[PDB]
Design a protein around this ligand. Structure first.
Ligand code: NA
Ligand code: NA
Length: 480
């Protein structure tokens, strides 16, 4: 063992709705493992509001593309049988499977129900702006085509506490069901950020807490998951997520890795949440993503010495899942903040070659995003994955000492031959920098894995070497 861990989000928002994705994953297993991928984060695998739903408009958590509901049997990605077949391929190829879990809300309700509600202030859900009146809310779920397979639980309006659409008078408003409280504790942006979209689940009810725990365990056992990616957890009561997590680890024999999506460009907020979780999971390093974006947007003037500053990985590398972009940050999406092609290579070297953090590769970057004419960066990434997989080991030395050129090295480890590397980059004019790589690598000649620089670096007697990088580029030297 000892091999570094590399996660990969296997999907992008504009993937084709051809129902063959699971099959593609199945066929890609061997190649992904060989490339350096050790864990695959799959998109929500259950029936959404429609066949083409990316998965977040979650309709039925027990329908993994097995029953005819919402106008389709399969999900956008494929059928339950093809999913299971894919997971089998992943497992036999030494790849962990983390399932995306959406429990904040539900959508695609089978029918509406009359509910007493009040409109609240969009920027302050604490502030009611209307008196209580009766609206028709899409809260009724009967899961017709499933026939109570796996579970006979049915959802009704009293399991929720809000919606953003009154079907009686057909109007958009943030509604809080009268005589129900907004979950707590939850992110406080907008006062109370319990409500995001769809029909918001109220976890105050015991029957709801238990249902999602049982489902969580059913799902876990059904797919033999090795962990989860928790969707929109800042909108879900902190106390419940912890309960749920502890419950799953209790029911499952296998270990379970957990990464939560707490979307906020504020590391303090993330640390607070992790505090409440008692550090029993990691979170996506959202501030680091925005640092990459801020740098991508600004240009060379951006001071590279601050690239990791304010990042979650900087403070708690053991609890940070680092990434460059995702299905929400890609162009045109809800959390759009795309890292341009010029800077993206630097961002990836940063999360794949450094020692801290559990790095995640984005499918959209790897294979490209045809919808927006974004080329596949597979070539560039595979060289960084080769570096991480075979060379990013041993003691690390940082050099964020210049506004343009920065770098770091890894001395390597006896446990893994020829390991050791020196990453150097610049977001402006090129340059060079002497860096220590371990007197034990002395007399060695290192070359750039990325091919961005032809310089051949020989390590002197004191274990030092001068490394070169061109402008707006990044190079990763290793003893190959
Ligand atoms: Na919520
Ligand atoms: Na700069």
């Amino acid at each position: 063992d000892g091999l570094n861990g590399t996660m990969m989000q296997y999907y992008e928002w504009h993937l084709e709705n051809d129902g063959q994705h699971w099959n593609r994953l199945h066929d890609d297993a061997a190649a992904l493992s060989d490339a350096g991928i050790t864990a695959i984060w799959i998109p929500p695998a259950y029936k959404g509001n429609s066949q083409a739903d990316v998965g977040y408009g979650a309709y039925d958590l027990y329908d993994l593309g097995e029953f005819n509901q919402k106008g389709t049997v399969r999900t956008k990605y494929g059928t339950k049988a093809q999913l299971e077949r894919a997971i089998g391929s992943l497992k036999s190829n030494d790849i962990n499977v983390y399932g995306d879990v959406v429990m904040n809300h539900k959508m695609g309700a089978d029918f509406t129900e009359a509910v007493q509600a009040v409109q609240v202030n969009p920027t302050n859900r604490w502030q009611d702006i209307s008196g209580a009146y009766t609206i028709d809310a899409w809260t009724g779920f009967d899961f017709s085509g499933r026939n109570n397979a796996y579970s006979d639980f049915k959802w009704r309006w009293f399991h929720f506490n809000g919606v953003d659409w009154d079907q009686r008078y057909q109007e958009n408003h943030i509604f809080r069901f009268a005589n129900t409280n907004w979950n707590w504790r939850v992110d406080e942006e907008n006062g109370n950020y319990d409500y995001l979209l769809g029909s918001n689940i109220d976890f105050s009810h015991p029957e709801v807490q238990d249902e999602l725990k049982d489902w969580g365990s059913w799902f876990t056992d059904e797919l033999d998951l090795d962990g989860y990616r928790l969707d929109a957890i800042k909108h879900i009561p902190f106390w419940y997520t912890s309960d749920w997590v502890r419950h799953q680890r209790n029911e499952a024999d296998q270990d379970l890795f957990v990464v939560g999506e707490y979307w906020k460009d504020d590391v303090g907020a993330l640390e607070f949440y992790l505090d409440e979780m008692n550090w029993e999971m990691s979170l996506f390093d959202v501030p680091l993503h925005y640092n990459f974006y801020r740098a991508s947007q600004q240009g060379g003037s951006y001071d590279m010495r601050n690239i990791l500053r304010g990042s979650l990985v900087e403070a708690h590398p053991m609890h940070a899942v680092t990434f460059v972009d995702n299905h929400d940050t890609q162009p045109g999406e809800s959390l759009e903040s795309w890292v341009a092609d010029w800077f993206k290579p630097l961002a990836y070297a940063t999360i794949l070659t450094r020692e801290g953090g559990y790095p995640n590769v984005f499918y959209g970057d790897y294979y490209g995003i045809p919808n927006d004419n974004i080329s596949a960066k597979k070539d560039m990434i595979d060289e960084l994955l080769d570096a991480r997989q075979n060379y990013a080991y041993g003691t690390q030395h940082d050099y964020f000492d210049h506004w343009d050129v920065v770098g770091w090295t890894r001395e390597g480890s006896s446990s893994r031959p020829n390991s050791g590397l020196a990453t150097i980059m610049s977001n402006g004019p090129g340059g060079s920098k002497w860096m220590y790589v371990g007197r034990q690598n002395a007399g060695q000649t290192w070359t750039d894995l990325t091919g961005n620089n032809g310089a051949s670096v020989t390590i002197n007697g004191d274990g030092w070497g001068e490394f070169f990088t061109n402008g707006g580029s990044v190079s990763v030297y290793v003893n190959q």
